[PDB]
């Protein structure tokens, strides 16, 4: 228990300095400029922002997980999770085996746990997937630009074969969507905005010219309009993607072969990737927490200069009501940056082990496409991430390494504010 300040500042000399800076409005104003600039780096910039890279990384890991495993994942049946007798259902723009589609044509077995994925669950997964790929392909916006949209996300699936009822669309009046050329509007909420979808139905006969299934089919097109692309929006989709996979917990089976890296386990149930799925969920959650710091930073601009209220010298004990704002802003920035770092450390294979490590290095953080733009599904996407997972970790690191000064400024600003806040009680 120290009696006085000189004995206290003998030992901790940086504290003397920090007091001198707390009394000097030009020092204070410099700190507040820094907070301006470092804020711009976190939420206004993209490639140089750890926050941006961490969000992108969380999204990419969810997408990549499905790009790795979706082709091996067994799916089938009819509506409401029922088994089917001869129902083939095909989703376009999905990473199937040697294909840009996933066929779900497993008949007879009941969809469910350690079983086929229901078409209901696929649908739910696929929409999240289509939106994420579309956004990745268009490139994500800076964190603060949370009011933009994707003009158009469009995806189709097709149902064929006797008894297949997966393209029957009910609608809220209880009326069926007209199967030949029906077309109807739907809504849902995506971070607090109402998004319309134009859902439409087409029938194509067996004998139609170059219907290559020589089987008649119903095609469902879904056209979403003005889909929000904020972080908070795409994380929620990512969350839906991975939680869908995880709750449905379908059976899957990959054939390993000789040569390549080796899937462990080769077969089982998707939710058996507990370590992988946990981390992806944790990444998503931490990116949500990080993004929520954006508003705290915005609510507390630091661009108004601060002075000795009346042309007379600055008094730290009375002239510094701005300090609670400045403390909260800096703490928000620090928190973003930590969260950002936490996100990369959850998936970075340098700290992984075992089969989880062999998942990320052998599969997730690779791409067998032959480098195409993000969001691209090709006939070699399957069994590899193809979501720039390594490149994204590398950039998160590079962004963090290039934030060394900025991080020190934030700390300094925080202590200065803290110091003022203190003086400011009494």
């Amino acid at each position: 228990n120290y009696e006085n300040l000189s004995k206290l500042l003998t030992r901790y000399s940086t504290l003397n300095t920090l007091i001198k800076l707390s009394a000097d409005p030009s020092a204070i104003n410099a700190a507040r400029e820094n907070l301006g600039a470092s804020a711009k780096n976190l939420i206004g910039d993209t490639k140089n922002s750890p926050a941006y890279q961490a969000v992108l990384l969380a999204i990419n890991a969810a997408v990549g997980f499905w790009n790795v495993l979706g082709y091996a994942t067994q799916c089938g049946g009819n509506a409401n999770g029922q088994e089917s007798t001869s129902s083939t259902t095909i989703f376009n723009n999905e990473p199937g085996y040697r294909s840009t589609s996933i066929t779900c044509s497993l008949n007879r077995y009941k969809p469910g746990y350690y079983g086929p994925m229901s078409i209901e669950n696929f649908k739910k997964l696929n929409e999240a997937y289509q939106i994420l790929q579309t956004a990745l392909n268009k490139g994500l916006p800076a964190l603060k630009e949370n009011n933009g949209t994707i003009k158009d996300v469009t995806y189709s699936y097709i149902c064929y074969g006797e008894g297949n009822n997966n393209c029957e669309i009910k609608l809220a009046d209880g009326q069926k969507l007209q199967q030949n050329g029906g077309s109807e509007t739907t809504t849902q909420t995506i971070d607090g905005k109402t998004v319309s979808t134009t859902i439409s139905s087409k029938v194509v006969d067996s004998t139609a010219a170059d219907n290559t299934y020589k089987q008649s089919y119903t095609e469902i097109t879904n056209a979403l309009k003005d889909v929000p692309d904020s972080a908070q929006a795409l994380l929620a989709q990512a969350s839906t993607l991975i939680n869908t996979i995880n709750t449905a917990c379908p059976y899957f089976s990959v054939t390993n072969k000789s040569g390549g890296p080796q899937m462990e386990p080769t077969r089982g149930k998707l939710c058996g990737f507990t370590e992988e799925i946990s981390a992806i969920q944790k990444m998503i959650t931490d990116a949500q927490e990080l993004v929520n710091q954006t508003s705290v930073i915005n609510e507390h601009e630091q661009s108004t200069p601060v002075g000795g209220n009346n042309g007379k010298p600055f008094n730290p004990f009375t002239d510094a009501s701005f300090a609670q704002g400045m403390l909260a802003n800096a703490s928000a920035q620090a928190k973003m940056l930590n969260l950002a770092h936490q996100v990369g450390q959850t998936i970075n294979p340098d700290n992984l082990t075992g089969t989880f490590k062999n998942f990320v290095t052998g599969f997730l953080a690779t791409c067998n496409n032959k480098g195409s733009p993000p969001g691209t599904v090709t006939t070699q996407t399957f069994a590899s991430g193809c979501a720039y997972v390594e490149q994204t970790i590398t950039n998160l690191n590079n962004s963090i390494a290039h934030f060394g000064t900025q991080e020190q400024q934030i700390q300094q600003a925080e202590n200065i504010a803290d110091t003022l806040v203190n003086f400011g009680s009494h």
């Epitope: 620090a334 940056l337 930590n338 770092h341 450390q345 970075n348 294979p349 340098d350 700290n351 590398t394 690191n397 590079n398 963090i400 390494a401 934030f403 060394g404 991080e407 700390q411």
Partner: nanobody
Amino acid sequence: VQLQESGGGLVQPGGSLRLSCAASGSIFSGNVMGWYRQAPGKLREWVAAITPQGVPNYADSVKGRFTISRDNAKNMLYLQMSSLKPEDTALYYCNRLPNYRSWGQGTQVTVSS
């Protein structure tokens, strides 16, 4: 979570020094690491950083003079310091980026004619 710097001393200007930091693997592994210094009357200033892949970057005040490297097998971090001016006199500290909140003891570097 431990950070231990060594290697500093007193030198004439134009001198060089090799700073070392043993970091725990929790700190080091898979992390960007970096060097810092704290001169009399100033607050800690970031000096350099290096990614886990070995990409270095530096502060304008030391670019061209200092070199940062990491031995990924020994959880070790180094600062090769050349052409030392009196302005580089400071306690030097090592840490990951973003920082672990408990700093090591640091190592004193004093430059004078």
